[PDB]
Design a protein around this ligand. Structure first.
Ligand code: NI
Ligand code: NI
Length: 150
């Protein structure tokens, strides 16, 4: 009882759109079944449950970065419903520097760091690691963090 879903992963000369799915249950990012470079898209095969889609849209030359957090809900009929639960606009040079922020949410640090290379998709490692926090605390800490950073 599986379902397929599509996020955008592309780093172009002018802009970058980087979305990745984080599993609520496994408390770490999801391995995509297929990375599509020709069109800048990843492909996931998701089991019924909840996951979270982090999004990072960047207009390089306008120093612009927006970061979104959306909640992805997959029920039994294989049906899919989405709602943004957070969205924030800010300069990109700030965003990129968040990687180096010693004390700052890890998954956020990880996310930014997994952005896709030029003309390519990103890709998720076969990891077994999980983070201490649960979906709620995780999102809050992230929110709470960027707030101060901004
Ligand atoms: Ni439901
Ligand atoms: Ni909140």
């Amino acid at each position: 009882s599986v379902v397929e879903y599509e996020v955008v992963s592309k780093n172009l000369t002018s802009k970058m759109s980087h979305e990745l799915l984080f599993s609520v249950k496994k408390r770490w990012f999801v391995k995509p079944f297929r990375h599509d470079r020709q069109l800048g898209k990843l492909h996931y095969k998701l089991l019924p449950g909840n996951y979270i889609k982090f999004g990072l849209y960047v207009l390089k030359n306008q120093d612009y970065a927006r970061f979104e957090i959306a909640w992805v809900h997959v029920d039994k009929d294989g049906k899919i419903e989405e709602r943004t639960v957070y969205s924030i606009e800010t300069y990109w040079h700030i965003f990129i520097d968040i990687e180096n922020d010693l004390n700052c949410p890890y998954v956020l640090a990880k996310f930014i760091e997994m952005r896709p290379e030029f003309h390519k998709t990103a890709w998720v490692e076969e990891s077994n690691y999980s983070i201490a926090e649960d979906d709620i605390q995780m999102v809050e800490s992230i929110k709470r963090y960027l707030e101060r950073k901004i």
